[PDB]
Write a protein that holds these residues in place. Structure first.
Motif, PDB file in Angstrom:
ATOM      1  N   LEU A  59       6.659  -3.790   0.863  1.00 55.12           N
ATOM      2  CA  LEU A  59       5.512  -3.490   0.056  1.00 55.12           C
ATOM      3  C   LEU A  59       4.813  -2.180   0.432  1.00 55.12           C
ATOM      4  O   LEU A  59       4.121  -1.618  -0.394  1.00 55.12           O
ATOM      5  CB  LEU A  59       4.525  -4.664   0.034  1.00 55.12           C
ATOM      6  N   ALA A  60       5.008  -1.694   1.653  1.00 51.94           N
ATOM      7  CA  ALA A  60       4.377  -0.473   2.118  1.00 51.94           C
ATOM      8  C   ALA A  60       5.156   0.789   1.920  1.00 51.94           C
ATOM      9  O   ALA A  60       6.243   0.892   2.336  1.00 51.94           O
ATOM     10  CB  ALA A  60       4.020  -0.603   3.553  1.00 51.94           C
ATOM     11  N   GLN A  61       4.562   1.738   1.237  1.00 54.75           N
ATOM     12  CA  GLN A  61       5.185   3.040   1.013  1.00 54.75           C
ATOM     13  C   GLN A  61       4.539   4.086   1.924  1.00 54.75           C
ATOM     14  O   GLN A  61       3.311   4.109   2.081  1.00 54.75           O
ATOM     15  CB  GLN A  61       5.061   3.483  -0.449  1.00 54.75           C
ATOM     16  N   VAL A  62       5.362   4.941   2.530  1.00 56.40           N
ATOM     17  CA  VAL A  62       4.867   6.090   3.280  1.00 56.40           C
ATOM     18  C   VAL A  62       5.430   7.355   2.645  1.00 56.40           C
ATOM     19  O   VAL A  62       6.657   7.506   2.527  1.00 56.40           O
ATOM     20  CB  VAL A  62       5.223   6.030   4.773  1.00 56.40           C
ATOM     21  N   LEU A  64      -4.037   4.087   0.719  1.00 54.10           N
ATOM     22  CA  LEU A  64      -4.546   3.423  -0.472  1.00 54.10           C
ATOM     23  C   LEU A  64      -4.117   1.958  -0.429  1.00 54.10           C
ATOM     24  O   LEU A  64      -2.911   1.665  -0.403  1.00 54.10           O
ATOM     25  CB  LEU A  64      -4.036   4.129  -1.721  1.00 54.10           C
ATOM     26  N   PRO A 106       0.790  -1.242   0.000  1.00 54.89           N
ATOM     27  CA  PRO A 106       0.000   0.000   0.000  1.00 54.89           C
ATOM     28  C   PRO A 106       0.827   1.298   0.000  1.00 54.89           C
ATOM     29  O   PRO A 106       2.030   1.286   0.288  1.00 54.89           O
ATOM     30  CB  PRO A 106      -0.812  -0.099   1.301  1.00 54.89           C
ATOM     31  N   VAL A 107       0.167   2.408  -0.322  1.00 55.41           N
ATOM     32  CA  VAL A 107       0.733   3.743  -0.193  1.00 55.41           C
ATOM     33  C   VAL A 107      -0.036   4.496   0.875  1.00 55.41           C
ATOM     34  O   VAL A 107      -1.270   4.505   0.859  1.00 55.41           O
ATOM     35  CB  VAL A 107       0.665   4.533  -1.507  1.00 55.41           C
ATOM     36  N   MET A 128      -3.297  -1.937  -9.591  1.00 56.86           N
ATOM     37  CA  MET A 128      -2.316  -1.392  -8.653  1.00 56.86           C
ATOM     38  C   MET A 128      -0.931  -1.944  -8.969  1.00 56.86           C
ATOM     39  O   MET A 128      -0.733  -3.159  -8.976  1.00 56.86           O
ATOM     40  CB  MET A 128      -2.714  -1.698  -7.206  1.00 56.86           C
ATOM     41  N   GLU A 139       3.248  -1.732  -8.145  1.00 56.37           N
ATOM     42  CA  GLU A 139       4.331  -1.380  -7.234  1.00 56.37           C
ATOM     43  C   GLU A 139       5.612  -1.984  -7.784  1.00 56.37           C
ATOM     44  O   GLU A 139       5.604  -3.130  -8.247  1.00 56.37           O
ATOM     45  CB  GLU A 139       4.080  -1.886  -5.818  1.00 56.37           C
TER      46      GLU A 139
END
Lengths: 145, 145, 145
Positions: free
Chosen positions: B38-41, B68, B1-2, B112, B114
């Protein structure tokens, strides 16, 4: 549609931004037939180091495209569109594809306003244009390249 | 996710940004099982005075998080994660909970991308990650903190 | 609701922003009844020239409102609200209607947190606020204009 493009400050010169905007705009017109002037590309620049991947701070080579569309297209069309965006922003921005993230969100065309007008269904593109006033038509007409 | 984390410019030192990003990333990892990397901040800073609540200009203390996610998870789980983001952001940011806003949008995984690849359905990140090119795995792997 | 509002730097003076915050906040409360203070207006400024329409670079007269809502309201109401934001921002910001774009996204209230608490379904806003803590009630209450 509106394409929110989150990049690091300075990583794209005005020529790169312009190339990236053209690549996304041409990709979208190509696979959906929606006229050029209907596609917004909005760069959001932020200093490098504001993007974190897995808790790990990043340099300035991350690119997150968040596309906002109307509902009504097939998952297949949307797959191709995100793939072509990936490949055409990698080229246009001279960045490698692993650095590129792309999300599509969709909304009813009944709650989407562009140029102050409610958007039509993707089964309504040409008729919607011809029933716009001539001052609006002309103004949209200018945003093509 | 973002996770788009909207804050006042200079509210967070680099390490507090670091602390907030880690708090959200471990949160999401803890609860969905999806791999760290996998997680973007993505911190979006704006000058203080740009946030209006009930029409009232605000200071530098507001925090909006727009997560998201892929479609597919339950409502109980999703609430758990959002409640947890409020709590651990509050600690990592040393900011009161009453300042924290958290919204979760979802999209089919099929739309989606990534690291230039399409995401799997949720719960399937294991095989998906094994069928990637070895170079993509290696790049991704280095994004674990 | 959260209203992300994307404008060019210095296009809106502090009073202009307050004016746009007000027109948005008052149109939303005016049509859904939901309490004043529950609306955030978040201004995302960027340098002029970062907006492209149809691949053509823009000056500083573009406005994109991205509205983030709870699910449960009608297309009819969502429509009136969008049209009212266009009209009330064109006046508040002194910009032709043709320059305002407005998108509404929806999320289940159960994955939405304002002031550190889950939101209610739109048909429950009164007795939800009646079970908040003194400080919460007090906190939100000060952000009424």
């Amino acid at each position: 549609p509106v394409y929110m493009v989150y990049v690091s400050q300075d990583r794209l010169t005005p020529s790169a931004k312009h190339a990236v905007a053209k690549a996304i705009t041409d990709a979208h017109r190509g696979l959906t037939g929606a006229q050029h002037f209907l596609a917004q590309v909005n760069f959001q620049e932020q200093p490098a180091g504001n993007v974190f991947l897995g808790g790990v701070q990043q340099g300035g080579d991350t690119i997150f495209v968040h596309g906002l569309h109307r509902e009504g297209r097939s998952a297949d069309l949307k797959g191709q569109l995100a793939q072509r965006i990936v490949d055409d922003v990698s080229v246009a921005a001279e960045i490698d594809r692993k650095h590129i993230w792309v999300y599509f969100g969709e909304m009813p065309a009944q709650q989407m306003v562009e140029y102050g007008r409610f958007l039509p269904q993707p089964g309504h593109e040409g008729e919607w244009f011809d029933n716009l006033s001539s001052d609006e038509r002309a103004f949209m007409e200018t945003n093509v390249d």
